[PDB]
Enzyme design. Structure first.
Site, PDB file in Angstrom:
ATOM      1  N   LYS A   7      46.636  43.196  32.153  1.00 26.81           N
ATOM      2  CA  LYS A   7      46.169  43.978  33.077  1.00 26.81           C
ATOM      3  C   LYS A   7      44.697  43.629  33.064  1.00 26.81           C
ATOM      4  CE  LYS A   7      44.413  48.594  33.701  1.00 26.81           C
ATOM      5  NZ  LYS A   7      44.405  49.417  33.005  1.00 26.81           N
ATOM      6  N   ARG A  10      45.588  40.888  36.044  1.00 29.25           N
ATOM      7  CA  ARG A  10      46.121  41.520  37.344  1.00 29.25           C
ATOM      8  C   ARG A  10      45.134  41.200  37.554  1.00 29.25           C
ATOM      9  NH1 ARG A  10      47.765  45.685  39.136  1.00 29.25           N
ATOM     10  NH2 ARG A  10      47.859  46.327  37.047  1.00 29.25           N
ATOM     11  N   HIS A  12      41.202  40.940  37.462  1.00 29.28           N
ATOM     12  CA  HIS A  12      40.089  40.438  37.116  1.00 29.28           C
ATOM     13  C   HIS A  12      40.416  39.196  37.832  1.00 29.28           C
ATOM     14  CE1 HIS A  12      38.063  44.528  36.675  1.00 29.28           C
ATOM     15  NE2 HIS A  12      38.662  44.274  35.163  1.00 29.28           N
ATOM     16  N   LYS A  41      40.964  51.854  44.278  1.00 25.46           N
ATOM     17  CA  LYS A  41      40.406  51.251  43.299  1.00 25.46           C
ATOM     18  C   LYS A  41      38.228  51.053  43.726  1.00 25.46           C
ATOM     19  CE  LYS A  41      39.069  48.072  39.316  1.00 25.46           C
ATOM     20  NZ  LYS A  41      39.436  47.738  38.175  1.00 25.46           N
ATOM     21  N   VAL A  43      35.680  49.859  42.847  1.00 25.78           N
ATOM     22  CA  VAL A  43      35.122  48.836  42.506  1.00 25.78           C
ATOM     23  C   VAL A  43      35.528  47.824  41.735  1.00 25.78           C
ATOM     24  CG1 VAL A  43      32.603  49.734  43.077  1.00 25.78           C
ATOM     25  CG2 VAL A  43      33.815  49.105  41.281  1.00 25.78           C
ATOM     26  N   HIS A 119      38.728  44.333  29.372  1.00 26.39           N
ATOM     27  CA  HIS A 119      37.596  45.096  30.328  1.00 26.39           C
ATOM     28  C   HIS A 119      36.920  44.408  30.613  1.00 26.39           C
ATOM     29  CE1 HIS A 119      35.321  49.078  31.630  1.00 26.39           C
ATOM     30  NE2 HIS A 119      34.432  48.393  30.198  1.00 26.39           N
ATOM     31  N   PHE A 120      36.266  44.420  32.167  1.00 28.97           N
ATOM     32  CA  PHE A 120      35.402  43.993  32.040  1.00 28.97           C
ATOM     33  C   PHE A 120      34.427  44.713  32.642  1.00 28.97           C
ATOM     34  CE2 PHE A 120      33.609  40.477  34.610  1.00 28.97           C
ATOM     35  CZ  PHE A 120      32.299  41.391  35.441  1.00 28.97           C
ATOM     36  N   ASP A 121      32.883  44.416  31.697  1.00 33.17           N
ATOM     37  CA  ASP A 121      32.242  45.996  31.768  1.00 33.17           C
ATOM     38  C   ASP A 121      31.154  45.933  33.140  1.00 33.17           C
ATOM     39  OD1 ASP A 121      31.585  48.110  30.135  1.00 33.17           O
ATOM     40  OD2 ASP A 121      30.132  47.184  29.744  1.00 33.17           O
TER      41      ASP A 121
END
EC number: 4.6.1.18
Length: 124
Positions: A7, A10, A12, A41, A43, A119-121
């Site tokens: 995920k 896909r 990022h 979504k 952002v 996860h992209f923080d």
């Protein structure tokens, strides 16, 4: 189901281009990556680097995530990124985005074995 690591790819990763090349980049990519299927979504960030370079961030500078968790990591180098943010005209299912290209450090959360980004923080 799709794994968290898959995920992240896909959502990022865009190793196929070095930078956004037009104002339409986000509109096209948000749709093509299935990020607008159920809702717009608001952002999202795409990273224009090799997957290996992004995965390597999990071995770089440990930092707190925005929410306080301590499994986040900041890249030592800046990376080519594209920020996508919903515009005022966006209206599901015709989701619309502003494209901004930048070179920033990325902060990701990592999990698993192999220990990879999930996860992209933030970008800083």
């Amino acid at each position: 189901k799709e794994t968290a690591a898959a995920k992240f790819e896909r959502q990022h990763m865009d190793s196929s281009t070095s930078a956004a090349s037009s104002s339409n980049y986000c509109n096209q990519m948000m749709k093509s990556r299935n990020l607008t299927k159920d809702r717009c979504k608001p952002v999202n960030t795409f990273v224009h680097e090799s997957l290996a370079d992004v995965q390597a961030v999990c071995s770089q500078k440990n930092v707190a995530c925005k929410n306080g968790q301590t499994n986040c990591y900041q890249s030592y180098s800046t990376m080519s990124i594209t920020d996508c943010r919903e515009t005022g005209s966006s209206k599901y299912p015709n989701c619309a985005y502003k494209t901004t290209q930048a070179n920033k450090h990325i902060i990701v959360a990592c999990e698993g074995n192999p220990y990879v980004p999930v996860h992209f923080d933030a970008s800083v």
